[PDB]
Design an enzyme around this catalytic site. Structure first.
Site, PDB file in Angstrom:
ATOM      1  N   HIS C 246       1.053  -1.247   0.052  1.00 43.38           N
ATOM      2  CA  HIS C 246       0.060   0.013   0.141  1.00 43.38           C
ATOM      3  C   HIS C 246       0.857   1.380   0.097  1.00 43.38           C
ATOM      4  O   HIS C 246       1.768   1.334   0.885  1.00 43.38           O
ATOM      5  CB  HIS C 246      -0.938   0.100   1.127  1.00 43.38           C
ATOM      6  CG  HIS C 246      -1.869   0.965   1.198  1.00 43.38           C
ATOM      7  ND1 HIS C 246      -2.737   1.288  -0.038  1.00 43.38           N
ATOM      8  CD2 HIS C 246      -2.317   2.129   1.938  1.00 43.38           C
ATOM      9  CE1 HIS C 246      -3.838   2.263   0.233  1.00 43.38           C
ATOM     10  NE2 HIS C 246      -3.471   2.693   1.431  1.00 43.38           N
ATOM     11  N   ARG C 266      -7.062  10.840   0.584  1.00 42.34           N
ATOM     12  CA  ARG C 266      -6.407  11.421  -0.612  1.00 42.34           C
ATOM     13  C   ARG C 266      -7.600  11.895  -1.392  1.00 42.34           C
ATOM     14  O   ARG C 266      -7.182  12.388  -2.451  1.00 42.34           O
ATOM     15  CB  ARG C 266      -5.453  10.428  -1.038  1.00 42.34           C
ATOM     16  CG  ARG C 266      -4.207  11.065  -1.747  1.00 42.34           C
ATOM     17  CD  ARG C 266      -3.236   9.877  -2.281  1.00 42.34           C
ATOM     18  NE  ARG C 266      -3.903   9.076  -3.219  1.00 42.34           N
ATOM     19  CZ  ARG C 266      -4.050   9.275  -4.366  1.00 42.34           C
ATOM     20  NH1 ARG C 266      -3.603  10.433  -4.954  1.00 42.34           N
ATOM     21  NH2 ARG C 266      -4.431   8.323  -5.363  1.00 42.34           N
TER      22      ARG C 266
END
Ligand SMILES: Cc1cc2nc3c(=O)[nH]c(=O)nc-3n(C[C@H](O)[C@H](O)[C@H](O)COP(=O)(O)OP(=O)(O)OC[C@H]3O[C@@H](n4cnc5c(N)ncnc54)[C@H](O)[C@@H]3O)c2cc1C
Ligand SMILES: CCCCCCCCCCCCCCCCCC(=O)O[C@@H](COC(=O)CCCCCCCCCCCCCCC)COP(=O)(O)OCCN
Ligand code: SF4
Ligand code: F3S
Ligand code: FES
Ligand code: FES
Lengths: 239, 264, 594
Positions: C246, C266
């Site tokens: 990740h 994000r």
């Protein structure tokens, strides 16, 4: 502010031990387990710890951080002043195995004494129907990472050894409560919660609810309701 | 030795390793309980300054006045028992039951088990007692009758509510005036504390297995649980309101003026 | 040493291990459960997703066909199609029988189990309970084991007449007879004493390899055993180059080091993508990691080895606390970092290994022996990438399959194999070797840190052939320096000794990963090359297997290129259209089109 901390770790086995003084660099924003791992990596390679994961979803890293039963992977190390000593010792209720690892077996033989969940003996697996308000009460007790801090702090077993045989502990009375509140269970357990597992030995001085990392309202949601449910059966003169 | 000095546990020769001020909560609890009990036992036995015959104020410490020795107008339910021999309080009907209700309270029990009985003074401090039987032997098995003192408390709260309702009388009809405000706030907080009880939470809906089958009791249980999450606060709050109400009424009965909004 | 004779030994009590124990017990056998940690404290407790199961509780257009298609799409058509089919069409029943063991999921307005949405899944599938689903699963399985042994106590007369749990016991070798499993040698963590289980069948179900990497979100026990156990016993590993990373997850504050940062945060103020956040958000996370490593290798890499991902010059103070509630509370109570005021320090964490022991699909693994594997330690499902929720129902499905296959193998066994003493001798010698003087000594923790650094730096998200053999060359010197590791102290719970023992498994799985990642010359899912950016070649009917040629404690591996079985019988649906299959497959169908 990466200062040098003053630690005091209990080192020893079941034959006796002491508190030893150590000095470790503490960087900003790190838990007690980080300091213990640094100590292992640089000073004392053979220090018993018994950690598994580093997020608090386990119960492995239980100890007594400054006289208070806490998880080592959650104690922030900022709680303590930069000039004060931190005293880490194992749990003082269970038998000690080595430095910081205790023998949590009492509360694994207490596990296989409580009757288990039994469903009706006609229902099929794909045909279980429960409403959310029925499962809400038990879903809170099912949050139990088995830390056994509750079992450690209870004065019934912590301060009296002869009550280990008669009291099951707060964790295993919360288990009985959440099996009693299950909407599909069948066994009663109200009589045995008092006669076999000594629910009457608990005075309501919470002291358990105060140490649960999961913030389970053990006393208000599990122990007092079960005491009232036992009073219904044994001490209610309305018959 | 006994409990953390047993031969199989870690060898720490310390009653506790806590470095905080863990002895502060039991001390404060002791001082609060002692102050309240001293005040209540002096005022209930004083035998005067409990009834304003004009604006009809009556102290909760004299809630049902069932003697013919009471101030004319004080008895709201009738005068039944003669005169009393100076060591039976004038409110002998209700004060035993209120004392029992607060004595067998799941919160007060925790408070004085920690403070007086020295069952754990703090969370992880070594208990000074060698043997422990909990609430299993005789004198402490009787704490399970809290649910009947709960019914007694409901009835006493109804009596107090009647008194506070009829306390709205100035000599020239209706009345207001800050004795009513204090009496009414005291009654409302008594009701809140009574409905915060763990026995109430159990009797209404806490004893059901299926909430989806009971829509009304589920609602009542939800509200009572929200109230009960703060049972500790209301105990002390109601002790304080009882003290303040009795004090204000005593001052007004003996001498001060009553700050009214409707004439006398 | 103490000897215990059983029918099956299950080295691991997680989801797969416990389900296999249950199924083997009710098939009727004597089962031993060996756990490295306490009972019920496996890595499954950290899972917070759900169990992907086509139960059709939310919407009834779901199916096992669309679930199979979703599993094959997410794995870029590298999956073992038989295992994916089996998991797709058997996952509902496993979740349904979980709730007969006492589990309490979240409920719908009808009383059925509630299902969430997730990324790769077309329909709502993930059965959940709050955000603690692995905890519920592992509690249910542990308490079901306890129920079973209460029944044993009531009818047979002893709590451990069928099932016995040896928690806090580490297994180091698998004893072989003539190629067939004959036992399992290990030690007690508490006493340091040696245990020998004499069983003809073994179900590994151990877990991942995440402790070989510096930044990782894996437990203490994820040292790569199970993989190395089977490898140096008799078996082969597949897809070791497919490790799930990740690109985010805080790196600096050691209180929060493996904690993955999702893309939702994000979906706001971000790190950098040439504009709009200094939006080029959501661009494929392999390119997100490419940008991160390009800015770290030559640029303002922060002292922790990561990047900022600052959200402070954004929705100022209140919108964060509600849009990201649990992350905020966790960070403030754990790292004392308030996200509304400070910039994070995020980097490419390591989450999951999608390869492992090459198992047979229907019954579990092994070439010669009576060895079986399930869970994360097995390979074939989750071909090149995995779906959220599949890793948690895969446990139930194939743990039950492994228990049943072990039961049948034991029942159909003519004569039981028996252990030799000239192998228990060698096992004791290897496990006691780190207790010698060992001139010019080493340290377990120094070697572990060097391995972690090298693996995280050179075999990370985006690989290069020039720097993936640099790690292959420095692993040689690291395994040469392992020959002088010394442990200080005795055997009574010496974690330095435990680390010196697990280093020989880390050094095998690392060589496997690196040798496979050097040889797969194409990018697909969890394996990103750099000089071969051209996704998805005909490296699809190729598995890139690994086996131990020959040696001693840290054995040299060899990697081979075998084909896969002819893809699918009629499992070329119409849900699988030609326009979609022809992007992945060689022009080899010749059958699909109607
Ligand atoms: C932080 C995190 C979050 C995750 N979240 C999700 C999610 O939301 N959804 C999802 O689908 N998947 C998730 N996963 C992945 C998923 O949890 C795995 O598929 C699964 O947990 C693997 O468990 P397992 O059954 O293989 O064995 P595990 O549960 O990992 O445990 C293996 C057991 O084997 C024992 N063992 C290991 N080595 C030895 C040895 N040498 N000797 C004896 N015993 C040994 C260990 O003590 C352990 O008890 C997550 C993983 C992590 C790390
Ligand atoms: C705002 C109001 C709130 C109330 C505040 C008041 C403060 C109260 C403080 C005083 C109470 C403190 C009690 C704390 C515990 C002490 C009681 C106790 O522990 O009992 C001991 C003392 O009891 C005796 O041994 C003697 C009892 C015999 C007396 C005979 C007559 C008493 C029977 C009373 C009948 C009940 C009347 C009904 C009224 C509700 C025996 O010890 P044990 O049974 O608990 O064992 C545990 C460890 N060994
Ligand atoms: S109850 Fe709270 S404290 Fe007692 S064990 Fe479960 S979690 Fe730890
Ligand atoms: S600590 Fe022990 S005594 Fe009762 S409330 Fe908690 S159990
Ligand atoms: S290590 Fe898992 S709870 Fe602290
Ligand atoms: S009054 Fe506090 S519990 Fe009944």
């Amino acid at each position: 502010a990466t200062y040098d901390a003053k630690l005091r770790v209990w080192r020893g086995d079941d034959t006796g031990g002491e508190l030893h003084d150590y000095t470790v660099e503490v960087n900003d924003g790190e838990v007690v387990l980080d300091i213990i791992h640094r100590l292992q990596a640089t000073q004392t390679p053979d220090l018993a710890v018994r950690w598994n994961c580093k997020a608090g979803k386990c119960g492995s890293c239980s100890a007594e951080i400054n006289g208070r039963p806490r998880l080592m992977c959650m104690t922030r190390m900022s709680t303590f002043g930069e000039d004060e000593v931190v005293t880490v010792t194992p749990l003082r209720t269970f038998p000690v195995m080595r430095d910081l690892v205790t023998d949590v077996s009492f509360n694994y033989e207490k596990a296989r004494q409580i009757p288990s969940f039994t469903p009706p003996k006609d229902l099929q697996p794909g045909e279980y129907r429960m409403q959310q308000e029925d499962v809400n009460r038990s879903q809170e007790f099912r949050k139990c990472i088995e830390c056994f801090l509750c079992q450690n702090v209870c004065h019934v077993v912590r301060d009296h050894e002869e009550n280990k045989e008669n009291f099951a502990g707060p964790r295993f009375h919360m288990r009985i409560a959440e099996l009693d509140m299950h909407p599909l269970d069948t066994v009663d357990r109200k009589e045995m919660a008092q006669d076999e597992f000594g629910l009457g030995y608990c005075n309501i001085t919470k002291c358990c609810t105060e140490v649960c990392p999961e913030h389970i309202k053990i006393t208000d949601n599990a122990l007092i309701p079960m005491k009232e449910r036992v009073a219904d059966r044994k001490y209610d003169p309305i018959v | 030795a006994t409990g953390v000095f047993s031969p199989r546990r870690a060898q720490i020769p310390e009653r506790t390793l806590r470095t905080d001020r863990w002895w502060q909560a039991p001390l404060l609890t002791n001082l609060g309980l002692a102050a309240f009990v001293i005040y209540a036992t002096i005022r209930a036995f004083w035998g005067s300054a409990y009834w304003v015959a004009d604006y009809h104020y009556l102290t909760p410490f004299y809630s049902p006045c069932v003697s013919t020795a009471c101030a004319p107008g004080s008895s709201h339910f009738g005068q039944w028992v003669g005169d009393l021999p100076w060591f039976i309080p004038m409110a002998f009907i209700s004060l035993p039951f209120l004392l029992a209700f607060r004595l067998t309270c799941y919160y007060y029990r925790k408070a004085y088990y920690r403070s007086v009985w020295q069952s754990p003074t703090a969370c992880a401090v070594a208990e000074p007692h060698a043997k422990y039987t909990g609430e299993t032997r005789f004198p402490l098995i009787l704490q399970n009758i809290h649910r009947y003192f709960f019914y007694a408390a409901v009835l006493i709260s109804l009596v107090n509510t009647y008194d506070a309702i009829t306390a709205f009388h100035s000599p020239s009809g209706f009345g207001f005036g800050l004795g009513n405000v204090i009496l009414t706030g005291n009654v409302i907080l008594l009701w809140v504390y009574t409905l915060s009880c763990h026995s109430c939470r159990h009797v209404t809906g806490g004893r059901l297995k299926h909430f989806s089958k009971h829509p009304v009791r589920y609602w009542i249980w939800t509200q009572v649980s929200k109230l009960n999450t703060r049972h500790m606060l209301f105990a002390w709050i109601t002790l304080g309101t009882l003290v303040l109400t009795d004090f204000y009424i005593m001052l007004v009965a003996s001498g001060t003026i009553s700050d009214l909004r409707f004439i006398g | 040493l103490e000897r215990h004779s059983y029918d099956v030994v299950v080295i691991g009590a997680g989801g797969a291990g416990l389900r296999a124990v249950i199924e083997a017990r009710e098939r009727g056998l004597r089962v031993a459960v060996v756990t490295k940690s306490l009972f019920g404290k496996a890595h499954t407790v950290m899972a917070e997703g759900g169990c992907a199961a086509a139960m059709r509780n939310v919407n009834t257009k779901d199916s096992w066909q669309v679930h199979f298609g979703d599993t094959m799409r997410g794995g870029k058509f590298l999956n073992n199609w038989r295992m994916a089919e089996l998991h797709a069409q058997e996952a509902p029943d496993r979740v349904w029988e979980l709730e007969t063991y006492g589990a309490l999921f979240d409920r719908t307005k009808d009383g059925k189990i509630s299902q969430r949405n997730f990324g790769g899944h077309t329909y709502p599938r993930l059965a959940h309970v709050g955000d603690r689903t692995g905890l519920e699963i592992i509690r249910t399985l542990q308490q079901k084991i306890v129920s079973l042994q209460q029944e044993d106590k009531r009818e047979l007369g002893d709590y451990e007449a069928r099932i016995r749990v040896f928690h806090e016991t580490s297994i180091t070798e698998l004893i072989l007879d003539d190629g067939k499993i004959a036992g399992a040698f290990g030690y007690y963590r508490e006493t340091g004493n040696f245990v020998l289980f004499e069983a003809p069948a073994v179900v590994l179900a151990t877990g991942g390899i995440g402790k070989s990497f510096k930044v990782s979100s894996n437990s203490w026990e994820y040292t790569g055993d199970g993989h190395a156990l089977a490898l140096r016993a008799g078996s082969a590993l597949i897809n070791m180059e497919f490790i799930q990373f990740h690109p985010t997850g805080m790196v600096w504050p050691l209180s929060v080091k493996g904690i993955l940062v999702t893309e939702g945060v994000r979906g706001d103020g971000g790190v950098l993508k040439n504009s709009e956040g200094k939006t080029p958000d959501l661009l494929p996370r392999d390119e997100v990691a490419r940008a991160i490593n390009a800015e770290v290798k030559a640029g303002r890499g922060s002292p922790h080895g990561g990047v900022y991902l600052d959200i402070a010059s954004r929705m100022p103070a209140e919108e964060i606390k509600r849009r990201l509630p649990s992350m905020y509370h966790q960070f403030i109570e754990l790292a004392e970092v308030d996200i509304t005021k400070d910039a994070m320090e995020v980097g490419p964490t390591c989450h999951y290994v999608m390869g492992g022991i090459e198992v047979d699909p229907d019954t579990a693994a092994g070439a010669t022996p009576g060895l079986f594997a399930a869970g994360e330690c097995s390979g074939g499902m989750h071909g090149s990438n995995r779906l959220g929720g599949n890793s948690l129902s895969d446990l139930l499905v194939f743990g039950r399959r492994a228990g049943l296959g072990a039961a049948d193998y034991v029942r159909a066994l003519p004569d039981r194999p028996k252990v030799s003493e000239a192998a228990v001798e060698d096992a004791t010698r290897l496990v006691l070797a780190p207790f010698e003087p060992k001139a010019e000594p080493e340290n377990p923790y120094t070697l572990h840190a060097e391995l972690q650094q090298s693996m995280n730096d050179l075999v990370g998200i985006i690989r290069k052939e020039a720097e993936i053999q640099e790690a292959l060359d420095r692993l040689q010197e690291l395994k040469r320096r392992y020959a002088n590791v010394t442990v200080e102290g005795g055997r009574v719970f010496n974690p330095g000794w435990h680390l010196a023992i697990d280093m020989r498994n880390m050094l095998l799985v690392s060589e496997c990963v690196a040798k496979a990642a050097l040889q797969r010359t194409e990018s697909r899912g969890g394996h990103t090359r750099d000089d071969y950016p051209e996704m998805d070649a005909n490296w699809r009917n190729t598995l890139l297997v690994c086996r131990v040629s020959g040696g001693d404690p840290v054995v040299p591996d060899v990697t081979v290129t075998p084909e896969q079985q002819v893809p699918m019988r009629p499992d070329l649906l119409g849900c699988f259209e030609l326009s979609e299959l022809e992007k992945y497959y060689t022009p080899e169908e010749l059958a699909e089109h109607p």
